[PDB]
Each structure stands twice: as structure tokens, then as C-alpha cells.
Design a protein around this ligand. Structure first.
Ligand SMILES: NS(=O)(=O)c1cccc2c(O)cccc12
Length: 278
């Protein structure tokens, strides 16, 4: 760890503690993640997966049989920006710019067959320039909150797809708009049933094969779907339309990131600058 001076703790990651640190040789300030052969080779692929909307993996230090991941440092995450913007809410043009950029990031990773698997506001990092970036991408395959988990994961599907990231991002889109988490479950069954209460209990009509999933139960209660107009007011019809497609039950029907980028919601997309106090 010789060339890094720890400045402060900035996160208790899923995979260990994250520090702000300075590279004693480059002068660069970085986020240093202390992780705690296949994982080695996986991580190595991620070092090549470079995109403006993906937090850059600067370096991977395997030493003393230990693993440190050196990332690009950003000063703020979406959860904290949302908490700070709660009285007024994030302006819609910024919501739309953030959603657009995240879909670009996703489209990139997905075309390389890399999934995130654990998108959440805490791992979406923002800068003063109006950029937003996906952090911790691909780490889950290389090696707490249920709120953003796709229903096929909850129902015990082991071979899930890139569609899981689209589901998570839909949940985040909803939360930016309403300033409340869409599905704040506190256990797997509470999470599932929150989803069902809003989108309707799924069946063979809307999701062929659902009743054959590993944790599906014929005893699940049967709730009717709510209208989105009740779910994410005052989002306009383009936004609600896009959100509905990101939240399709069947992962095969769920919109892809590339198709989402062509959606009419993005016709008037721009790139505003947020007001960040650092
Ligand atoms: N996702 S996180 O909470 O570990 C985190 C927090 C602040 C900055 C980070 C960063 O620059 C790169 C990755 C994760 C960060």
C-alpha cells in the first residue's frame, strides 16, 4: 500500500472499505477499495472496459495476497445529491440528462456482455461538470439493499441477463422523480410483494414461464396493477412510457439500454450543470 496515503473513509463497500487516498508518485487523488485467480482475471477484463460514464479503474494492486482496486475519485454520489435536492427535487432536465448518460454507460457494458448486477444510487457518482458515472461495474461477477433488485433475481433465476440493470435503473429514475424509493423492501418477500402491489402479481399472461421459477409460489397473493400516473406523478407521458418499458416483468420484453436511448423521452435531452456543494 506503500505509495498511497489515506485521506479519509468515503464508503463501506459491499466488498470492503473505500478510502479517499493520494498517490504519492502521481499526485493523483483516487478512491482506494480494499477487497474484503479467476477474480484476478475478471478484474483484469474490467480495466479495459473504459467509457466516459463508467468510473475508471486506474489500477489493480495484488500484493501480499491482498487486492486493492484503485478508482477514479468523484466527490459526490446520487444518493447524497438526492438527499440534498429533496426540498425542491432534481430538475427534470437534469434527471433526464442523468438517465440518458447512465443508459449510455449501460449500453456500453452490455454490448461487451458485462452486467452491473447491483445498481443503486450510492454507486452512481456525479461531478461538477454535469456528468454521472457507474461505479463498481462487474465487481459482482468477479466476486444489502434489495430496493433495486429485478424480480427474476428475487424469484431465484440464476441465469439472469442485462435486463436486471435496466430494472434497477428504472427504479432509480422513479426515485429521482418522486423523491421516494419506488420499492423499499426490507426482506426478499417484502421486496417482491411491494413490486406485486404496484405492478400487479405477475402471471403467465404477462410473463410466460414465471410460474415455473424456483421461488415462485402459487400461494402468492394476487394484487392488481396500479396505473403509472399514480406511481410517478408528475412525470409526463414520454417518461411514464419509458419507465413502463424499463419495468416490464418479462426480462425478454424489458427495453434494452440501446433501445431506451432512442425513446422519445430523450428528444429534448440536454446536459445541465448541477449545483454541488463539496
Ligand atoms: N461506491 S462507493 O461508495 O464505494 C464510492 C464513494 C465515493 C467515491 C467513489 C469512487 O470515486 C469510485 C468508486 C466508488 C466510490
Amino acid at each position: 500500500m506503500e505509495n498511497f496515503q489515506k485521506v479519509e473513509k468515503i464508503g463501506e463497500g459491499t466488498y470492503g472499505v473505500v478510502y479517499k487516498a493520494r498517490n504519492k508518485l502521481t499526485g493523483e487523488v483516487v478512491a482506494l477499495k480494499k477487497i474484503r485467480s479467476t477474480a484476478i482475471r475478471e478484474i483484469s477484463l474490467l480495466k479495459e472496459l473504459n467509457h466516459p460514464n463508467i468510473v475508471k479503474l486506474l489500477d489493480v494492486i495484488h500484493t501480499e495476497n491482498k487486492l486493492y482496486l484503485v478508482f477514479e475519485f468523484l466527490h459526490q454520489d446520487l444518493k447524497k445529491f438526492m438527499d440534498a435536492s429533496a426540498l425542491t427535487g432534481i430538475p427534470l432536465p437534469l434527471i433526464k440528462s442523468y438517465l440518458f448518460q447512465l443508459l449510455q454507460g449501460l449500453a456500453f457494458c452490455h454490448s461487451h456482455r458485462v452486467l452491473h448486477r447491483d445498481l443503486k444510487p450510492q454507486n452512481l457518482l456525479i461531478n461538477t461538470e454535469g456528468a454521472i458515472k457507474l461505479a463498481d461495474f462487474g465487481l459482482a461477477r468477479a466476486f444489502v439493499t434489495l430496493w433495486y433488485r429485478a424480480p427474476e433475481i428475487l424469484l431465484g433465476c440464476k441465469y439472469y441477463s442485462t435486463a436486471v440493470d435496466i430494472w434497477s435503473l428504472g427504479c432509480i429514475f422513479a426515485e429521482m422523480v418522486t423523491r421516494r424509493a419506488l420499492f423499499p423492501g426490507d426482506s426478499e418477500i417484502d421486496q417482491l410483494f411491494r413490486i406485486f402491489r404496484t405492478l400487479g402479481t405477475p402471471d403467465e399472461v404477462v410473463w410466460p414461464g414465471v410460474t415455473s421459477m424456483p421461488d415462485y409460489k402459487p400461494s402468492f397473493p394476487k394484487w392488481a396493477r396500479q396505473d403509472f400516473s399514480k406511481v410517478v406523478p408528475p412525470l409526463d407521458e414520454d417518461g411514464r412510457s419509458l419507465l413502463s418499458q424499463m419495468l416490464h416483468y418479462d426480462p425478454n420484453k424489458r427495453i434494452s439500454a440501446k433501445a431506451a436511448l432512442a425513446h422519445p423521452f430523450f428528444q429534448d435531452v440536454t446536459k445541465p450543470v448541477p449545483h454541488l456543494r463539496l
